[PDB]
Amino acid sequence: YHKLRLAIKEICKTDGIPNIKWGMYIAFGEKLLKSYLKMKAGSASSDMIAEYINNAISAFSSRTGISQETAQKIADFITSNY
Ligand SMILES: [Cl-]
């Protein structure tokens, strides 16, 4: 997901994310994209997709030094581009 990784880095720069943390946001985004595409391909409902995304953002944002707002921007980039 070369294009995604690039886009996540730009989101990280905009949000002033400490660079030691970027790998974590990249991994979160790449994993979420793969799961989102699988769910779309299989005609998951809107409710199911929202629940999965919200669960992913909740779990990731529960880590210290991680921003829920930036996690949400990444999810939003995915759902608006893929
Ligand atoms: Cl990509």
Swiss-Prot record:
Keywords: DNA-binding, Virion. The keyword DNA-binding applies. It is found in: Virion. One of its GO terms (cellular component) is helical viral capsid. GO terms for molecular function: DNA binding. The N-terminus projects into a DNA groove. Heterodimer composed of major capsid protein 1 and major capsid protein 2. Self-assembles to form a helical, filamentous nucleocapsid mesuring 900 nm in length and 24 nm in width. Together with capsid protein 1, wraps arounds the DNA and maintains it in an A-form. Capsid proteins probably maintain the DNA in A-form by non-specific desolvation and specific coordination of the DNA phosphate groups by positively charged residues. This certainly protects the viral DNA under conditions such as the extreme desiccation of its host. This is Major capsid protein 2. It comes from Acidianus filamentous virus 1 (isolate United States/Yellowstone). The chain holds residues 51 to 132 of 132 of the full protein.
